[PDB]
Ligand binder design. Structure first.
Ligand code: GDP
Ligand code: GDP
Lengths: 90, 314, 90, 314, 90, 90, 90
């Protein structure tokens, strides 16, 4: 895969939210940087960080019927691996 | 950004927990005007049953959608891990009402986190929370007291409505469904009494700045209301509002700010406005900030409703 | 029901009067506002209030053979619930 | 995986053996809500007759589908060789009920293996097993005692319902079909009393976390229930639940946790909730974890059912 | 049958009463809940309870020539079986 | 055949289970590795091991109407022979 | 961008007015010079200045259905950067 995290799952927890899940890392991650926004949209993406002990993240305020692109960065003191990106159409 | 300066006031009401979700669903059914409704709960099934339109499931990685139990710490941790969803829902609002029932796990622990997020977003945050009945035990009451103390640190105003005060006006031999329906009605009444000064004002109106003057960095607040009809409607309604059981815990002369909402039809008179104001200012303190406005109910005839919110009690 | 009062009964006490009955409320009501008039009539309705401790109201001066619509408002300091309306044909 | 955090609680009931399969088939017929039912048996013909929907034939290479006989060791070996099918059926559940009749071969020997698999899967495992009547001899009773001792090592809670306690309430000159139908009803009552706090809660509810608080790593448990109607329904139902013959073997003041289910219609009152809680907490110990919730039965009018589960008896 | 009680008999003791009989239960019943009312009628049914040691129940105030539906609930601490219902036309 | 085991039989023990049978080996097998999953499915296969003295294996949790592929590995200290695979459509 | 301000937003506050918004500057601006007029029109543009602490400007007297061009100059004692221009069609 060469990108940390290697697996990415998205589930619609509510009709206006998304639940995001990734696999546990082999090396300790300090925090995860998640950048979500409309796919191919001119508006800037929204960004937030969760601590590295977590494995799930919830994003709200999502307009139904609009495509979204979600990217997760795993920031560790021991690597600089690529992020993983997923596309979800609400 | 330019449109955010040329739009109507955005008011959001978020119910936290099962009781808060039920109260907000009641407000949705009863059609408060010009308000957007949200429900925040750890229990996914309860959220799926709540008919509020927009729901947020917090703590999905700590409670697995199965609820936080009766632990306020678990509810706090559930809200702490989804501050992004709370921020995304709250963003874009001028005033936020946080309705909750103190005593449980989700509401008691998660209302302070939503309040903290809302205040850090620079939003006028009003917490309308209840305390449990004495029939619910001492553990629920202790949890409620702790949650109220925690919540008072992150809100502009915190309206406390003890359910024990409702027992004085509840019918004899009443089921708890009807008692909690009454509690829902009281919470909706507080939210509506504060928000309809803005959403549906009368001819003698106040703006959002006037409301923010008495509802900002005030602390503890209490609420009382009264109704009356006939020739003496104004004085009777004002005196009944001052003598509300939901206000007897405090002294109106110690409040640092009084907000008064007069709801009436198309037949309110100038002397009635003056006498309601005079009664409130007579039973208040000399240096308290008193804001008095009117709201419009087209279906009120020869009758007058007065709602009083006393802030900065301490 | 969502409207207070939930139940409404009308009985012709005399050939020119009506007796109106409603159920007791779960929450204290200060007064009841009763508005009666001809159903679908251009004339304004007649209105009066009884105290909230009451459960019955008598209306007089009713022309026989004319439909009437009766609405009861339960005014309390603790709710703003909808009224209940009934139709009676004398 | 993300959907496993945003779904309703998954409750599975597995009947092990002939008696367990009959009890679970009774539960299927009587329509417990929000529960999935399984039957596990060595006898293939009995499995083909059980109408539970999903069946698992264990020991197919040791018993050839012809049953394990009256030997608990053969049942244990039959369950030991099909741990994969047990794991596949159990996987994906939050709570599992293992219903069995101790004394035979399949149930007595195979319930501990299913319990071990369920616990190793990290599932809340509640074993609802009976003991045989004294009319069934001493060998069945010794097998039942050994199987219960073995089963207590791999369960979170183990509810023991002696059939001899049912003789006090069975009609005179009763056929064994009706006696075992009564035993099926008691097992279904235990499962329903624990599961309907989650599946169909009332307005005063508890979540799966609250249940897990008193049902996890507790050990032996006992169950009692009571019904009543009229004005004194709450006190009568609570006292009848405490004084159940299925609870007289223990002292409620020695339990390390009490779970109380109040089933009622839309007319439960706050003082009734308070008095049931007060009775239970008066007859319990001071440091016991007491969890009290309500369930909803729309067809109950002016009547009230109370179910008490006492855990951690030791 | 799957419903307790399994058998239900109704006899007109007097021209304005009914005698109701059910079989003895296999498991002790604390009380019986009897709900009687007009069959397919909008009026609420009348309800009362007899102790579980009884086997008969008398209902009075019955208008002749009117259909009635009678349902008996057997409330025991050891089961939650379905009720049994009968129709009687007076 | 060149693959151990040489024979493989699958029977539906219950509408949601399968019974798997293979022939006895000429050389002692320490354990059997069975890997089952949907035929041509992206989901990872499920794997488990039975001891080599056994000759049957039961797999549960099978969705009806879905094709399954079952492979059995015979792991012995005395050979490295190929596995045998079968297809069953439930 | 090389032009101060870098961002420019225009919103129709009323059917005959426009609200103009620009981003905050990195360096203190003494005043903003706004020049508005019909796009590609021979008439001279209208000009006014707002203080540099402001971030919004309202222009009135705008004929509907007529294109307008708005240019904002950021006048500071510490730079001479280019202005930014926008086109709005009323
Ligand atoms: N207004 C109102 N209050 C309720 C309702 N249900 C419970 N409450 C109160 O809210 C408190 C917290 O209970 P609950 O919200 O259900 O627990 P939680 O969901 O875990 O936070 C209790 O002490 C009750 O007094 C309801 O339907 N309406
Ligand atoms: N509840 C219930 N218990 C039963 C039934 N049949 C047998 N039992 C009890 O279960 C115990 C085990 O018998 P059984 O399950 O038939 O043997 P097994 O199938 O080889 O495990 C006996 O001692 C009986 O007391 C039944 O139909 N219902």
């Amino acid at each position: 895969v060469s990108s940390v995290p290697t697996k990415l799952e998205v589930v619609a927890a509510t009709p206006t939210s998304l639940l995001i899940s990734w696999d546990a890392p082999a090396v300790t991650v300090s925090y995860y940087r998640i950048t979500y926004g409309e796919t191919g949209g001119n508006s800037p993406v929204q960004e937030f960080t969760v601590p590295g002990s977590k494995s799930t993240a919830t994003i709200s305020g999502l307009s139904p019927g609009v495509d979204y692109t979600i990217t997760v960065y795993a920031r560790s003191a021991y690597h600089r691996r690529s992020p993983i990106s997923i596309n979800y159409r609400t | 950004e330019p449109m955010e300066l040329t739009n109507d006031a955005v008011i959001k009401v978020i119910g936290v927990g099962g009781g808060g979700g039920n109260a907000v669903e009641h407000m949705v059914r009863e059609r408060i005007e010009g308000v957007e409704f949200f429900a925040v709960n750890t229990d996914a099934q309860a959220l799926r049953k709540t008919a509020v339109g927009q729901t947020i499931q917090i703590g999905s990685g700590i409670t697995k959608g199965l609820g936080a139990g009766a632990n306020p710490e678990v509810g706090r941790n559930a809200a702490d891990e989804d501050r992004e969803a709370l921020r995304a829902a709250l963003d874009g609002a001028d005033m936020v009402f946080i309705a909750a029932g103190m005593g449980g796990g989700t509401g008691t622990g998660a209302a302070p986190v939503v309040a903290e997020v809302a205040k850090d977003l620079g939003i006028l945050t009003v917490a309308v929370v209840t305390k449990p009945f004495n029939f619910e035990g001492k553990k629920r009451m202790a949890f409620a007291e702790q949650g109220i103390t925690e919540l008072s640190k992150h809100v502009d105003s915190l309206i406390t409505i003890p359910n024990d005060k409702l027992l004085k006006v509840l019918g004899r031999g009443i089921s708890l469904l009807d008692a909690f329906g009454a509690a829902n009605d009281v919470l909706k009444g507080a939210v509506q009494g504060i928000a309809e000064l803005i959403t549906r004002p009368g001819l003698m109106n106040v703006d959002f700045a006037d409301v923010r003057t008495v509802m900002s960095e005030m602390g503890y607040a209490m609420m009382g209301s009264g109704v009356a009809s006939g020739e003496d409607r104004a004085e009777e309604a004002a005196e009944m509002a001052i003598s509300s059981p939901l206000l007897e815990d405090i002294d109106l002369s110690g409040a640092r700010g009084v907000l008064v909402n007069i709801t009436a039809g198309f037949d309110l008179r100038l002397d009635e406005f003056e006498t309601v104001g005079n009664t409130i200012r007579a039973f208040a303190s000399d240096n308290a900030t008193v804001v008095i406005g009117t709201s419009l109910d087209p279906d009120m005839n020869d009758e007058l409703r007065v709602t009083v919110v006393a802030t900065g009690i301490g």
